[PDB]
Each structure stands twice: as structure tokens, then as C-alpha cells.
Amino acid sequence: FQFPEIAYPGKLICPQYGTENKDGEDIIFNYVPGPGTKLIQYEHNGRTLEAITATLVGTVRCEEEKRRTVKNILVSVLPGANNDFANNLPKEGDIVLTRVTRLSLQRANVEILAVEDKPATFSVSQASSDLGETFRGIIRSQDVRSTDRDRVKVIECFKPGDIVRAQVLSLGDGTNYYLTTARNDLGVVFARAANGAGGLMYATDWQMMTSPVTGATEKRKCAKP
Amino acid sequence: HMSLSVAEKSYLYDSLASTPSIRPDGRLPHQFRPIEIFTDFLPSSNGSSRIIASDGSECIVSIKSKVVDHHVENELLQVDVDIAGQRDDALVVETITSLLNKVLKSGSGVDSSKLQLTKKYSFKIFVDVLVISSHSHPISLISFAIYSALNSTYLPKLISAFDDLEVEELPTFHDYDMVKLDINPPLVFILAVVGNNMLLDPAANESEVANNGLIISWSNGKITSPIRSVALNDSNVKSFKPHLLKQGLAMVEKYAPDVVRSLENL
Amino acid sequence: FIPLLKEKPNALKPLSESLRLVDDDENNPSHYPHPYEYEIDHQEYSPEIL
Amino acid sequence: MSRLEIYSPEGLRLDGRRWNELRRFESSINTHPHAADGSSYMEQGNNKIITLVKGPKEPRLKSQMDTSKALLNVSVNITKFSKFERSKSSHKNERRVLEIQTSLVRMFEKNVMLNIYPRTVIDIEIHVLEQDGGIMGSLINGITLALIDAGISMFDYISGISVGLYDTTPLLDTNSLEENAMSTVTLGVVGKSEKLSLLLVEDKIPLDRLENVLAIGIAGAHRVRDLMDEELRKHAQKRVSNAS
Amino acid sequence: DRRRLLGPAAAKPMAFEQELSLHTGFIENCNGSALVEARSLGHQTSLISAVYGPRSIRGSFTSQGTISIQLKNGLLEKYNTNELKEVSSFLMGIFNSVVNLSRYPKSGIDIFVYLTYDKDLTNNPSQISSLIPHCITSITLALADAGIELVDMAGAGEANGTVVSFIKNGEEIVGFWKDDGDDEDLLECLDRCKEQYNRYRDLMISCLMNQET
Amino acid sequence: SEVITITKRNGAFQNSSQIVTPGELVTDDPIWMRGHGTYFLDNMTYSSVAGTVSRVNRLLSVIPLKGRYAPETGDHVVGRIAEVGNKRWKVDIGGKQHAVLMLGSVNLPGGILRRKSESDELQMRSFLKEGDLLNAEVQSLFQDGSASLHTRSLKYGKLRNGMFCQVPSSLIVRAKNHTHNLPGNITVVLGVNGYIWLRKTSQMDLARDTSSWQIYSDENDPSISNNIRQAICRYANVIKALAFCEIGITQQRIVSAYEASMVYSNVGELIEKNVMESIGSDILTAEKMRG
């Protein structure tokens, strides 16, 4: 109640540290910056001071996350259709929907489109696909499947234009992210026959994708619903 | 321009942002670095100068004249800025060009009366700037060169009568004889803001860590427009207290005549 | 390693001067000096190979 | 308004020179140490040229990189105040200038092996401060001097010269007035040889004249080459004296 | 011209109470947009600011963001291209202090400011200086609407050709533009523009609250 | 000259053993082995550069008067990273090409205790980042002449607690050691490439005269006195002064100049030409009457 519910960018919310008196003992509230907030420095009358300042126009929400007691409060600002979602960025362990841009022999490079959130909902990264400003990622041949990691035919796994759900092992370099489809819930999700020329195809077996329209069957790496 | 590591920049800031400010070199907050100036080396032009800084920064200014009708030609002094190996279009070039043209306007910081020939014709002055090399904002470097050049410029002398309204004689100039261009070129000083300190003639490494900067013009023994705050770099730019702005204007106001005195020597 | 060399034909420097002990540098540990180092650096190549 | 001739019966030209005189030559090495690896300031007559050699160094773009030879670039900046009448527009994109730049590159591509600096770039920046005829020949001499100052290996000197023709006899080293009056031939000469790196004729020239005109130019270029060696050696002697 | 249609080249061109209106988020082409309209006396100014970013730059090793600002002539061709570059350089010197750059490493933020119109009435028996505080107002709104983190609200004012931009409630300065005018107006212009700043600030904050609501 | 020293000049653009000339012939003895700076045709050997003729054994070469610094194997150089790519950095040294570094040529924090990780090649920017300065030794040489660097030592690594300055590489020669301790509690690092680092003397330097997790931290020593800072500035200016006079920089020369410069109260007085020229001249004459 002490801190305003809604803060515009540049509005002071709460100081660095805080405390209160209850049950005959001092409870220490530790304020930490979050999404929409930024800890900056302000000085008055020759006095230095650090306080949590909102950087986005939104309602403000706090949440506790972890003799003498001990506490930790998370201060953040939430906006409040169009969605932007910049804070969202591919990090080790996240699941990401990608599209195959090109196929090589020892690997398969793609481009990042959307990223799966946490408890399905997704965060769509809006970018121009005809420029190259879109985040690029590379799926190694050893990261295709846990079964027989050594010898893997990349032609019989992915295909130019096919949508692949994967999980990023690491950032890698600025060029390529590291992608693995080793587990069951990862693999080619949406695809069409003949590089997109034919009809839609659906996933049946983990290593087989069929099309219940033209009766065409192409070998892919399919995931599990 | 200069590339420095995070460690070096912080050390520089500590050295310069200190209450007793120390230049990495050891200069005082009002001391300029030694420069060399050559003049009158382009016989093809009416005036010329060449300034060399201590860091190898070099600028060449040329002054050419042209008889124009001042009734149709509003601007009687045109500044042109260039750099070899550099595209003309660049943000820095046009900004300095626009800035310099304001510094040397016809009715702002220049006695345009000395350019008038007759009722109807006057001398258009073309100030061409060529920056061969520079490692910081060359605005003050160019300013010193333009000053030196304009103080050693010689224009043709008129012979015919100066009343085109009645008799209307074609502008003719006597051979050989020329008249020295008596004029008062303004100067442009650039300052650096590091914390609460203000430095005259910012070095390359100094400008990189500066919080802000000032561009202050100087003419007729007083501060004059254009006055512009400027980000010397773009990674450490911060807002500044108003007293710093007043400190900078005061700093120039007392050290400028010293600069002009060392610069006014023929 | 102590060179096994006991004679030095085609010498510009005495074998004597060649076999010597040098105190170790703080920067670098001391080693016995190759015995024909001088000869290699300052003996002249036959005109023919060139 | 005035009028003027070319060559008088008294054997005198419009400027006073006779048919076979080189203009005043001044040469200058290591003029911009803090701006380039090699530098030269040329004064051939009223011509004033700054030449900067930057390299060999890392290319700014890995796309433009040769693993067998260095990349040689030349940019000529003819300033708007080079002539008596200031040019309103920039001359940088001018087809005449692109040909000049191209010509100079072709010339020195065969004069530097350019096989010993792979994966590097040599950038040559030129600033023409003042122009008065034979600017092409002066450009050649400026690059040759600056390249040598940079310690960049080359097979030999390349000396540039300007030729002026009237009636039977050509005039050595032409100025703008003569250049205006009569057709000129620009010659690129390699070392003390008779081999031409650059042969440039842009105006009409009788076919009888050229063999003799070439002979005059080659002889004059040899004198120019000798002067350049003297100019650098003399400077070295002067510099040593200064050190002492 | 083989790029556009310039028409006949042998032809010649033709020879002859503060009020604010703020609107943001009306362009779906970019990440943030803003409309600023100001009418004082016989003089009025309407400009549009478009923000695109932050978008990742491939191979970029910059530990902070990179701001680029460009002013354009929407309708009336008045201001010189050289002068537009100068203001752009001035504007970037301001928001590099305003924008929290540490938040967008290896990224870049492009800012497009369209000066569609300005109307000038002059009686007969600088110029762009008056538009500057409106450009700052537009950009600060467009950035805040886009989601870009700003350390403080950037605003400015124009007094006798002397423009000075303030943040942290007028306590400090993020930009200073002085052209022509008169001397000894240092203290006066700093006080008059500070009032314009506070006025422009509250309307800017209210604007976000309104549209955001 | 109270505020600015402006030297002026009019009417001029600027101010002011066998002889060798271009097209010159050095020798006509076909027995010679032609080295750098030369070229040959049958018996005749010509010069390709302007310099002095050098005869070592049977190897005839011409040493140029000017040129780029050349990396020899085993040189102690100081370089600033130019680019990070793949599993290597390219570090500016000041030669024709950028220095080459291999992820396997550097030493990780925690060292021997540390276990090999395949994430290091993707996180090289956390060790060396563009702009960072460092000590390094020229480990090997490529075919063209490029250098491969290494920092596999406590002596080598990221630089901090000081300031950078550079002189022509010709003024710094090879020696037994290029790191030196000087009066004023400051330490100089004289790279053979001409790149010089002046810092506050650390424990490492002191030990030589007689934490492995923070070997890549951008953070400086939080406690650096003004007396050290003002010493660095003075050492910097005198080094620039020695360089201005074409004087070879050596540890003896630097300390000698540093104490000799004490005549001048303000450190900023050392930037003027006449001061620099006299300081260098006083050093040469001092070595004259002492030698």
C-alpha cells in the first residue's frame, strides 16, 4: 500500500532496503529489481541514494520468492490486441519453434520464430524474414536424436520449410544457437509434401510423417503431442 | 574514434573526474595542447591556412572570392567541409557544416560590410575546409584554421564607380593591386564535462569517458551563438546541472582572449 | 645435458670458450650453450650452393 | 579581354620558358607520420599534392579479402579550390576521375609484386591542393614516393611526365595554358627503362610527332627520376645532420 | 533521374495560450509511434515520430544499445538537409542519456521523425529552433510507448531561440541549443524553458495513462 | 602562451658508406645470396627499398630506413583485441595483420583444478572482449608472417590499474625482460611492438624483484592514490618526449628522464616541444660524459 499501484516510466516506487516492526522482532524486506523496473542512483542535497524506479507504464505487482526472520520481495511493473514481449529471449533450457532455412550435411541451420513460455502459450518474435534480422540457429547432426548419435542422415530428418520444435542447449556464437530435438516432444511439427508443394502432412510415428490426403509419406523427425 | 577497454576508461575517469582534476598528460582544465599553423601557401586562393595538432590532427582551409549580386545572394559567406577517405553525406560532416555556417553568418558574427563593393555587388566568400586527419570533434580545430585563414586573406581592389543604380558601370578591378580583408572571424571552443569538472580542448581519451560536452562560439570579446551541448561519446552521456553550463560559459569568457592573443600574431 | 663433443674441427671459437657455465636468468633457466652456435651464426656458406 | 599564342619565333612560350625546361620540382617525404604509414608532399610547379599510404593492414570487411595478394586502393580528392575558378560540384563521381583512378591502379598493379602481403589492404589517399597542368604525372610521382616511405616493396620507380606539342616540336612539362592551347601526352615511365606503365593521349596528335615526343619525354623523365633519388638521399643527409 | 519521377528538368519550381494534441500507438508498422500537434498564436507545428526496435544486429559486440535519429520533410520543403542532420545529432546526444542503454546489448533502436508540417506566418513592413522541443516530446512519447526503458522523461522549451532540455524534474540538463537571439538571457531562458518542460512533462505522462488505460 | 601555444608561418605549406638511390646497383657478384630489400637479374643485384646495404656472411640485404614492425618468434608484445570469432581472438598489435589467438593458447580461471568445457568456445567474450588490453608472447608464426599469441603464464594476461600509450616500434628493442619496476610505485610494460602499458606496481612485480578467478575482471584497484596517478602521467609524458627525439626507450632512459623532468613543477609542461627536445638532449649528453 505504501508504494503506488501503477507507475509511469521514471516514477519512484520503493528504496533499496526496507524493514518493519512485528511480533517484537524486525522483519527485513529486501527489494530487488524486476521486469519493468531498474535500480538507479539519485542524489539530493549532496546525498547519494539508490531506489527502485519503474521503466515501463504499468500496474505494479509484488511477490515473495526464495530467532530472526528473513524475507525477499520481487518488485515488477506489468503493462496495463498488440504484443511486443522484448524481455523474452532464447535462454538455455527454453523450447523454441523454428523454421528450416537451409540444409547441410553435418548440420541444419534454422531461424527462431517463437519461444515457449513457462506455466500452452508462446511468445512470437516479430522480425523481417526477407532481411536476416531474425535470430538464426543451428541444429547439430548429433543433436537430432538420442538414438544413434554418431550416424544421422540429415536429409531424412528435416526439410527446407518444415517447422521444428526444439530446445536450446546453449547460446553459441552470435550467428547460431544450439538446438536439440533429442527428446520425444521435439521434432518436425508442421510440414507439407515436396518442400511445401504438396498437401499438409501429419505426424504419426516418431521417424515417419504421413499425409492423409494424397497418401504421400515422407521421412521426417516427428514429435509427440 | 579511439577504442579503450572498460578498465582504461574507468581509470581515466578517476584521473579526470577527481576534485583536483588531472589530465592523463598532466594539463590544467584550461590548458590547450601545442599547435602549429601555416598560412598563405596557396597562391591560387585569396587566403589559406594549415593547422597541425599534437596528436597528428591536421586541417586545411582555403578562402576564395566571387563577385555576386547581394540582392539575390542572401548568404555572403559559405562554409564547405570535407575529409578524404570519408563520404560527404555523413552525419558529422553536415552537422559541422551547418554549425560553421551559423558561426560565420553575414549578419551574426562577421562584418559583412567589408565584403561590399558597390550598391549592387559584393564579395562572396567561400571557406573550404579539408580535414586530413582527426581523432576527436574537429570543430575547434577547424575554427582556429578558418580564423588564421581569414586574417591573411587578400581580395581584388575595385576601380569602377560604386553606384550601379544610376551610371551602372560594369565591375572592373585594377590589376596587381589588392586589399587585405579586414574582418573579425569568430572562434569555436569545445569543452568536456567529466563529473563536475570542465576541460578545455578535450583529448581523444578524455572525450571517450566524458559525461557531456559544450560547443561555445566567441566573437568581439564576448560569448555568442551558436552554443551547443554535444555528446562527445554515446555510451556515457548524462544530464548536467545548470551551474556546469554557466561554469563553461564563464571558463571560455576568461581564457578565450589568451587564445586570441596567441592567435592574433600576424 | 653435457655435450659429448671432445674435438671441435672448423672452429671460430675455442672449444674451451664453448664449454662454459652461465648463471640462470630470473626470466630464464640456465642451459649449456650449443658448441657451434657461433660458427653457425658467423661462418660463411660455400659460394656454390647459392 | 585578351589573346595569347603558343610558341614565338624567338623560341619563347607564354610563361617565358623555352621548349625544353622542367618546372620547379620540390619533393617531401614523411610529412604525415601520425596519419599514415607512408606520406609524401609533392610540389611540381604550382601543383600541390598530399599523398597518404595507409597499410598494409587488416581489411575492414572480411568479404573483401584476398589470401594470395594485398588489396590496392586509390582515392584521388581533387579539391574544389584546386583551380582558379572554384568548382561548385564535387568531382569524386565524375567518369573522368574514375578513369584516372582506374588508370593509376592498372599501372602499379604490374609494378608491385603484391604477392608478399596476403590478407592485407593498402589504401592510398590523395589530396590535390592546387592544380596547374600535368596533374596526372604529379599524381604518379606522389604515389611512388609515398609508397617507398611506407617501406612497401616495389620493383622500381615509376616517374610521370607531361608533354606539350606545337607544330613540329613538343614542349616539355605543360601548364594549364599550354594544356589549353595544345594537345598533351602523359607518360608513365618505369625506372630508367624505355618501358611505359602509362601512355595517355586524350587530344588529337599527328602520327609523325609521337616518336620524337616520346624520346623527349623519356629523357626528361630520367632527369626527374635522378632528381627524386637526390631528393630523398639529400633529405637523409639533412636529417642525419639534424640528428648530429 | 532513373530512381524516381522528377519530371521535366528544364522546368522551374513555384516562385512567389499554448495548446497541445498528443496521440500515441496509431501505427502498427513499428514498435512505438507518436503524434504531436502544437498551436500557438499564428504558428503551429504537427510532426510524427516512428520508432523501430529494439532489433538485434548480427555480429554486434556492443554491450549497450545504439540509437539512430533521422528527421524528414513530410510536406513543405523548408529545412536544409544539412540542418536536419545537425538537429538529429543534437537529439541523439539527449536520448543517449535518457534511454537505458544497458538493457539492450547487441541491439539497435532506429528513430524516424517525420516533420509533415509546420506553418509560419511572418509580417512584412532561429526557425527550426521552435520545433526542437516538440521533436523531443514526440520521441520521448514514442520511446515510452514502444517499451524502451527511459531513465527519465525528456522534455524541453524554446525561449528567444534558446532551447534547453531537462530531466529529473528540471534539476539537470540533457541538451542545450542556442542560436542568435540576445545575450544575458541565460537565467531567464533556463526558467522559462523549465516551465515549458514541466508543462510538457505532465501532459506526456497523462498521455500514456490515457491511451494505456 | 598562457593558454595556448600557436606557432605560425607564412608563404609556405610546411617548414624545415656508399650512397643508395632507386635504380641503383648494389653489387655484381653472383655468389651473394640475395635477402630482403633486394632483387636480382643474373649477376646484378639491385635495391628494392631506400636504406643501408647489409652484409651478414654471404647474405646481402638492404635494411629499409622506414617500415612496419615485424614479429620475431619469442617477442614480448602488448596487444588490444580487435575481433572475437570462432575459437580465437584477433588482437591488434600494430603490424600488417591482426594477432592470432587460439582458445587452447590461454589459461582459464581456477586452472589445473578447472575441467575442460565445450562452452568456453561459445563464451570467449567473457574472457577477452573487444577493446581489452593484454600481455602476450608470440608463440608461433604463420606462413605469411602473422603471429600466433599465447598467455599461458601468470606474467601474461589482461591489463588494468593504469593507462596506455604507444611509441614507434623501432624505439623499443628485444631484451631479457620488458616489464620493469620504477620509482613512484608504478610499473611499465614495454611491448616490443611499441605498445606500452603503465600501471600501479602489483604484488607480482614486487615478487620478481625480490585470485585466479579475477584475472579477466575489468575492475581496477579501488585504492589508487593521486601520487601514483600523477606519476603515471609524468612517466607517460617523458616516454612521449623520448619518442619525440627518436631516442630508444630503455628502463634506464625512462627513470633518468622521470627524475630529470622533476625540474618542471607542473606535469603538463612536458608536452611542449622545447621541453621534450631538451630532456632527450640532456639524456644523450648525460650518457656521453658518463660513458
From Swiss-Prot, chain C:
What is the annotated localization of this protein?
A: Nucleus, Nucleolus; Nucleus
Result of knocking out the encoding gene? Deletion mutant is temperature-sensitive. Impaired growth at 37 degrees Celsius. Impaired growth at all temperatures, nonviable at 37 degrees Celsius. Mutant is defective in the 3' processing of the 5.8S rRNA and accumulates a discrete species, 5.8S + 30, that is 3' extended by 30 nucleotides. Accumulates 7S RNA. Accumulates 5' external transcribed spacer (ETS) RNA. Accumulates extended forms of snR40 small nucleolar RNA (snoRNA). Accumulates U24 + 3 snoRNA. Accumulates poly(A)+ snoRNAs.
TM helices/strands, residue ranges: none
What is the top-level taxon of the source organism? Eukaryota
- Family designation: Belongs to the exosome component 10/RRP6 family.
Record text on subunit structure and interactions: Component of the RNA exosome complex. Specifically part of the catalytically inactive RNA exosome core complex (Exo-9) which may associate with the catalytic subunits RRP6 and DIS3 in cytoplasmic- and nuclear-specific RNA exosome complex forms. Exo-9 is formed by a hexameric base ring of RNase PH domain-containing subunits and a cap ring consisting of CSL4, RRP4 and RRP40. RRP6 specifically is part of the nuclear form of the RNA exosome complex; the association appears to be mediated by Exo-9 and not by DIS3. Interacts with LRP1. Interacts with NPL3, NOP53 and PAP1.
Miscellaneous comment as given in the Swiss-Prot or TrEMBL entry: Present with 2160 molecules/cell in log phase SD medium.
Task: Report the protein name in the record.
Answer: Exosome complex exonuclease RRP6
Gene that encodes the chain? RRP6
Curated annotation (Swiss-Prot), chain D:
One term under GO cellular component? nucleus
Q: For this UniProt entry, which segments traverse the membrane?
A: none
Compartmental location: Cytoplasm; Nucleus, Nucleolus
Q: Does the keyword Translocase apply?
A: no
Q: Which GO terms describe its molecular function?
A: RNA binding
Q: Decide whether keyword Mitochondrion is in the record.
A: no
Alphabetical keyword list: Cytoplasm, Exosome, Nucleus, RNA-binding, rRNA processing
What Gene Ontology terms for biological process does this UniProt record contain?
exonucleolytic trimming to generate mature 3'-end of 5.8S rRNA from tricistronic rRNA transcript (SSU-rRNA, 5.8S rRNA, LSU-rRNA); nuclear mRNA surveillance; nuclear polyadenylation-dependent CUT catabolic process; nuclear-transcribed mRNA catabolic process; nuclear-transcribed mRNA catabolic process, 3'-5' exonucleolytic nonsense-mediated decay; poly(A)-dependent snoRNA 3'-end processing; RNA catabolic process; RNA processing
Q: Which Pfam families match?
A: RNase_PH, RNase_PH_C
**Additional comment:** Present with 5150 molecules/cell in log phase SD medium.
State the similarity comment. Belongs to the RNase PH family.
Q: How does it assemble?
A: Component of the RNA exosome complex. Specifically part of the catalytically inactive RNA exosome core complex (Exo-9) which may associate with the catalytic subunits RRP6 and DIS3 in cytoplasmic- and nuclear-specific RNA exosome complex forms. Exo-9 is formed by a hexameric base ring of RNase PH domain-containing subunits and a cap ring consisting of CSL4, RRP4 and RRP40.
Q: What is the name listed in the Swiss-Prot or TrEMBL entry for this protein?
A: Exosome complex component SKI6
Source organism? Saccharomyces cerevisiae (strain ATCC 204508 / S288c)
Swiss-Prot record, chain E:
Indicate whether Cytoplasm appears among the record's keywords.
yes
Species annotation: Saccharomyces cerevisiae (strain ATCC 204508 / S288c)
| Similarity remark | Belongs to the RNase PH family.
Recorded GO molecular functions are: RNA binding
InterPro entries given for it? Answer: ExoRNase_PH_dom1 (IPR001247), PNPase/RNase_PH_dom_sf (IPR027408), Ribosomal_Su5_D2-typ_SF (IPR020568), RNase_PH (IPR050080)
Subcellular location(s) of the protein: Cytoplasm; Nucleus, Nucleolus
Q: One GO biological process from the UniProt record?
A: TRAMP-dependent tRNA surveillance pathway
Major place of residence: cytoplasm
In its miscellaneous comment, the UniProt entry states:
Present with 7380 molecules/cell in log phase SD medium.
Query: One GO term of the cellular component aspect?
Result: exosome (RNase complex)
Asked if the record carries the keyword Nuclease, the reply is no
The cross-references to SUPFAM superfamilies, in alphabetical order and at most eight, read: Ribosomal protein S5 domain 2-like (SSF54211)
Full protein name:
Exosome complex component MTR3
Q: How does it assemble?
A: Component of the RNA exosome complex. Specifically part of the catalytically inactive RNA exosome core complex (Exo-9) may associate with the catalytic subunits RRP6 and DIS3 in cytoplasmic- and nuclear-specific RNA exosome complex forms. Exo-9 is formed by a hexameric base ring of RNase PH domain-containing subunits and a cap ring consisting of CSL4, RRP4 and RRP40.
Q: Which keywords describe this protein according to UniProt? A: Cytoplasm, Exosome, Nucleus, RNA-binding, rRNA processing
UniProtKB/Swiss-Prot annotation, chain F:
Q: Which Gene3D superfamilies match?
A: 2.40.50.100, Nucleic acid-binding proteins
Q: Which residues carry this modification: N-acetylserine?
A: 1
Provide this UniProt record's keywords sorted from A to Z. Acetylation, Cytoplasm, Exosome, Nucleus, Phosphoprotein, RNA-binding, rRNA processing
A single Gene Ontology molecular function, please? RNA binding
Query: Where in the cell is the protein located?
Result: Cytoplasm; Nucleus, Nucleolus
The principal location of this protein is cytoplasm
What function does the entry list?
A: Non-catalytic component of the RNA exosome complex which has 3'->5' exoribonuclease activity and participates in a multitude of cellular RNA processing and degradation events. In the nucleus, the RNA exosome complex is involved in proper maturation of stable RNA species such as rRNA, snRNA and snoRNA, in the elimination of RNA processing by-products and non-coding 'pervasive' transcripts, such as antisense RNA species and cryptic unstable transcripts (CUTs), and of mRNAs with processing defects, thereby limiting or excluding their export to the cytoplasm.
Q: Kindly state the subunit structure of this protein.
A: Component of the RNA exosome complex. Specifically part of the catalytically inactive RNA exosome core complex (Exo-9) which may associate with the catalytic subunits RRP6 and DIS3 in cytoplasmic- and nuclear-specific RNA exosome complex forms. Exo-9 is formed by a hexameric base ring of RNase PH domain-containing subunits and a cap ring consisting of CSL4, RRP4 and RRP40. Interacts with LRP1/RRP47.
Tell me the protein family, please. Answer: Belongs to the RRP4 family.
Annotated protein name in UniProt: Exosome complex component RRP4
